[PDB]
A paper describes a structure:
The process is mediated by evolutionarily related signal recognition particles (SRPs) and their cognate membrane-associated receptors (SRs also called FtsYs in Bacteria and Archaea). The core proteins of SRPs and SRs are GTPases that each contain a structurally and functionally conserved NG domain where the G domain adopts a ras-like fold responsible for GTP binding and the N-domain adopts a four α-helix bundle fold. Here we describe the X-ray structures and solution conformations of FtsY, the SR from the hyper-thermophilic archaeon Pyrococcus furiosus (Pfu), in its free and GDP•magnesium-bound forms. The low resolution, solution scattering data complements our high-resolution crystallographic analysis and shows that the crystallographic structure and the average conformation adopted in solution are similar. While the overall architecture of the archeal receptor resembles its previously described bacterial homologues from the SRP/SR GTPases family, the structure of Pfu-FtsY reveals novel features: The elongated N domain lacks the N-terminal extension observed in all other bacterial FtsYs and is instead characterized by a long N-terminal helix αN1 that packs against the NG core in a different way; sequence analysis suggests that archeal receptors may cluster apart from their bacterial homologues.
The apo receptor was crystallized in two different crystallization conditions in absence of guanine nucleotide and its structure solved de novo using single wavelength anomalous dispersion of selenium; the structure is therefore not biased towards any of the previously solved homologues. Our Pfu-FtsY structure is the first representative from the Archaea kingdom. The Pfu-FtsY construct used in this study encodes the full-length receptor. The αN1 helix of Pfu-FtsY is not bent and its axis is shifted towards the core of the four α-helix bundle resulting in an overall more compact, albeit extended, N domain. In Pfu-FtsY, the N-terminus of helix αN1 is positively charged and could constitute the primary membrane interaction site supporting initial attachment of the targeting complex to the membrane and/or interaction with the membrane-embedded translocon.
Numbering used by the authors:
A (entry chain B), B (entry chain B), C (entry chain B), D (entry chain B), E (entry chain B), F (entry chain B): 0 to 23, 38 to 318
């Protein structure tokens, strides 16, 4: 339940190599892994795995399995499957990890966090849930409603924020996004508020280019942290989405929403490696505590079942 | 908390009439109500109230207040406010009510329900929640995944449906929507399943007009019930959305999502009167039981505080 | 200078018939006019003349010229050219004429005028100029800024209106258009203002269909007069534009802008006949008094030079 | 090779009924055909067969098979397969047939033919090929280039037409389509030309609605025959395309292009029944003689293999 | 009347600092200006002032006011208001000024001027008005109609140009823009004409990218001067518009239209600083002489009232 | 028949220079060629010739004709016309030529060829025709159907490929393009197939940028050869189309389709010079052998007649 397509293709690679070892102590032949890896590349490409992740996986798996001897009679599966597990693990932990709580505590207040992402990414609810998480840890929070052309989205943010006791700074419909965020930062300075979260637009407006707007807000607010948020069910999209954003304003961390429904998993496996930024939180449900700090070992076990 | 703009404008009308009675047993003069009602019309139009609802409100309020005597010394507010309450109540209960459970029990199985609405309406999660509600009442359910160009939306539906034990009938990406629904109906016939719910597209596709597609599915599946679903936060939209749908395929019932965040309320007040269909359920939160059967008196008290 | 293409094609028809009379008292033969009229139809169609106007012209010209004798030696040109002049004149004066000033004087105040047209039609400046014209005639005027998504257009209207002493009623960006117009009508009632002019949107908005919006405003404001405004330089467009509008809300009168630059003239010749509404004013320049009451004889002489 | 999906689903229905007869002189039971027909409906809907054709097929097949006795030992397949063949045949020959050559011979010249269809339908090459076919039969032809915003398409038409000795009437880029066609008709009158073919636009232009333009051309040219052309490979499209066109201007005949590559066949099977117009020619290749007069028996044998 | 929002926010900053000096010879404290400047930044951002202009203003105002002593009893307002005036003045006069008349006189003829800007900028009428201005100064002028897909715009240009005696070089609808401009330059060489003005497209065409087209015309015509034209009422737009253009072809000078109606003023204040090009002319009305050479002191007094 | 506009403008330049020599052994004066070349530049720009080709032509023609003496009485035309012929010839043969057959023979199999181009370019039929050409030369071929969102285009490719005995590798609708191509390369390795041809998308998809997709496929498949295909009738387009593609992935060779209908010829003359890649094949008809290897001398004679 989760990552089925990715898991099934990884298992099919283990079984192919195991066949070669059966027909065949014996040694695992490079020619045999090369062939099976060619089939795996086809499968992973169709499962939304980025090429550079496919290439890194080939490199790691080859280096781990070529030269290896299967003591005749033992359990092949686990030797081969152990190389694959290690390869996958290594591509997850490439990005330098970030301890949000320690970064905030040690920083001069307010710690300001800018969110980027396209509409449908789950950005607005993520911000409310993160505000709640921060408060449960003893931090005060204020939210800047800089998504100024979506009255509906702001109403929804306002309703979630009232419930958990965090203030939303907003101006009138169509206001300048950067002015709203700068306003929230001043308000936070005056009240000794620990963290400012910036809710941004997720689509261009008439003569207001999305990437240009993100650069302006970044220049105006000088964020401590830029977080990309992406919808895991949009497999064929999130990685290219994060590439565009990263190109306008460097991404520090990633949050993936609706991960519990992600039956594929190639994009989720790839994004951290490609963007070179750690996954900080995963959304795994519709309740507030359904935003969990990312746990590598939990992720790995969901991939391998 | 909810319907603030609507409530504030209704209260401002009560206060204006009360002023007239104070400056002024005295009698409440038609000229005085007419004037205050002109100001109310301006206010309700800016709060997304449909004109025909504004007109019905004027007619009812006028008929209830003109000729009425305020015993000098008593409480004016409650006499005037009582007319307004009755007027609003009468526009809510214009549509003939539908008892879903009794309609299903008495019908030949399967009872088939077609949903219509644009993307963003909350249609997909509503269907899962309604399936859950039906099961809690002893009905078996199957879902037809006829929204065949949204792989992400279907994954999400599949995940919710597995959790509550209802089967999803789906075909491959881009399949014919009507064929999927007809497939689910046959499957339901074979297994003695009580209810079939049809999850439809919410946007046009290249050479596949949304309204034309809805007519085809209706003709193919002959639904017992057609339910429009609409997002309450899209005040300026839901009523015109339902008008278009009603025009292609007659709407029997309405479900409004995200009502807990609706700080305005004019559209929600209007939609049943305009479409001449009862509101069956309201979405008031992110949990499954956050889809509640519509309760008129609860609604009225949320409007008047 | 003006209407050159139309004039040149009409003259070319006169010359062709005159040739036939020369080669040939003699009589003007129906076969000869029929042939020359076939060539004229080709020419007028390429000059934006609507088919039903082409057909009416053929019918009138044929009836006027067939059977007619040219006294051999006289001036042919003027006999033939006189039929054409009469035909053109008759298609201009098909619509029942409207005396705006007498309609206003005799009406119960305020007299309300709704304008319709697509952006680029010159609608906004036309309204200011008409307000000025009305004031020069002793009428008080107020303008409703119901084009609520164009901040730039409203600024421009505000600036023109301040200069001539007329008040503009406006709400905030994105407000409900009908509420603004109803507001201006109440304001006019309170101040004894003679005329209300309604400045409307000229393009659809996200989930706000232009024709649907025009019907709502009409229902809310119950205008005495609906005026279509169109840009004469958009030859291939204005007639179809007016057809669409007429279909949603009946057009009473037409104003054509930028007529002084119209080197073609087929559309301007056609529009009144097709819509069955008189041209009330023509825009012939950039100054305020460059909006002139339509004068049939002036128009005819501009066509024939 | 051709119509594989349609054929495979029809065969699968025959085999299901045959199973029922085997497990089971015996008689073919209505309950058995009903069930198998429910599965066929699912299959035909997914193969682009229109519902009303699915319904007519059910009606005919049921009437032909219910009550029928299979003499025990004989060949079931052919009895059942014979009913299906007859049903399919009857839906092909519903429209009254048109003998183009006899219609032209008996008509007053020029016989004018207007073509309608969206770009990509193969309309432009079809017109050239039909012109060639007409000439091989002794008719003179002229082509009106009324697709006036596609310089590339007209160049291609001009090149094909020069090769077969037919004249193309064209004006300058962006000219009025109706004026071009009326021009070609006059030219044809003057030269005693038998047939005029009108090449029309296949997409809307800025302020020039496609259906409105088609009505204008029809009114101006008064065609003897209106031919819809459609691309068979656009299965999910051609029927709705023809519906729209038929709605603006009644369709007399249909030509389907690229039929040799049509591996599906549901739309091609349906279109004549739905539009109530005969298929006149099929395009089965890239050479000029690859436009063949439609032959019902050839079509049937391609469907059944 | 003009620049009200900008003026009101600048005045509100003066009053805040003056309060601090009152509550408080005294000295003006940096902490006090810093605070008030933070509020000013919020206000100027919402008034369309570009960030780099906000930053330059902060830098200049701080440097001018910090350390300054208010002789107790004197007029504070004027000391503070004088710093602000100087700051604003310095951001206006950052770009090196251009004397158009002297540049033309001293140049080898023809002096060629290319205009860039999006449709709605007022580009076409600006060119006619500038041609008139040049002629009033003794220069001969020719206009290249390189906006070849807007027949309406060219008609309007032709009409204005005939009135003032300047020739328009134009080709047929849809012609190559660069060929038209090169044609006008040759024509000017042959007739000893002093100045060529190039009227360009203001929107992309099917497969004709606007910026790519501007580079081609620049390469073909080698202009002496490139002028950006922008509509002042499009506050949220002109600066980004000029950035894009500047990026494809370097801008030498700016003309702002409809400045008399500009009730905001932040964009108009910013554009010269951001683009590093002087404002050459302002449009302040609908008559020909309503295009005025830019006058810094007039501008400043309109800002401060 | 072909290249008429280009030829006519080149001839008009020869005649102008010849006039100068007549009015005038005499010598051909640089001033005379300069003038006539200015007129030629206007003409070639309007015929879709790229500026850098216009510039190279001027440079070559000037160098060849200036200083040249016409022996008085001889044939001027041929001396001048000979310079022009040489100039045109030199711009055609600027790109280093490619012998496809020798490149394939000498390469390690499979030789992989990636095609790029926008829809409507004739890419899909070109690939089938090239496959046929390769087979007639003794090479085995496989086609990768990487244009995965066009079911119709793939059906057509499948039908052409079956006829000539080449296999098409395809996956399901909407599959990952790069995975399909990598699949075809593995299949080719296993069967000893000489050449792999990659059929790519020609338009962007929702969140799948065309140029980004082309880079991915190139990275995944490491093609030996990248071929741009372009439609000659799209004069105003192909050169900019090839520029964009070249920018994402370097173009090695060009194929121009529908050249037999190209009545203009400026773009076809320019493209090789601008892209710095040879034309490998021209499409001159609808049959398979209507894809001809490019022949410079044949091309030149078609240009000059």
């Amino acid at each position: 339940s989760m990552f089925g397509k990715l898991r099934e293709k990884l298992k099919s690679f283990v079984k192919r190599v195991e066949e070669e070892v059966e027909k065949e102590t014996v040694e695992i032949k490079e020619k045999d892994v090369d062939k099976a890896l060619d089939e795996l590349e086809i499968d992973l490409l169709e499962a939304d795995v980025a090429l550079e992740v496919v290439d890194a996986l080939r490199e790691k798996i080859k280096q781990k399995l070529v030269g290896k001897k299967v003591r005749i009679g033992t359990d092949k599966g686990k030797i081969i499957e152990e190389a694959v597990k290690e390869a996958v693990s290594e591509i997850l932990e490439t990005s330098r990890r970030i301890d949000l709580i320690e970064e905030i505590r040690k920083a001069e207040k307010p710690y300001v966090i800018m969110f980027v992402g396209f509409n449908g990414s789950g950005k607005t609810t993520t911000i409310a849930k993160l505000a709640n998480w921060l408060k449960n840890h003893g931090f005060s929070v204020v939210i800047a409603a800089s998504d100024t052309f979506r009255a509906g989205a702001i109403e929804q943010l306002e309703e979630h924020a009232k419930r958990i006791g965090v203030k939303v700074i907003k101006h009138s419909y169509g206001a300048d996004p950067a002015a709203v965020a700068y306003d929230a930062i001043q308000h936070a300075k005056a009240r000794g508020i620990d963290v400012v979260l910036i809710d941004t637009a997720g689509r261009s407006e008439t003569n207001r280019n999305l990437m240009d707007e993100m650069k302006k807000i970044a220049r105006v607010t000088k964020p401590n942290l830029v977080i990309f948020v992406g919808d895991a069910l949009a497999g064929n999209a999130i990685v290219e989405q994060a590439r565009q954003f990263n190109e306008a304003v460097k991404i520090d961390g990633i949050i993936l929403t609706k991960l519990d429904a992600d039956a594929r998993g190639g994009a989720a496996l790839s994004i951290s490696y490609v963007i070179d930024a750690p996954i900080l939180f995963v959304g795994v449900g519709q309740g507030y505590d359904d935003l969990r700090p990312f746990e590598k070992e939990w992720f790995l076990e969901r991939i391998f079942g």
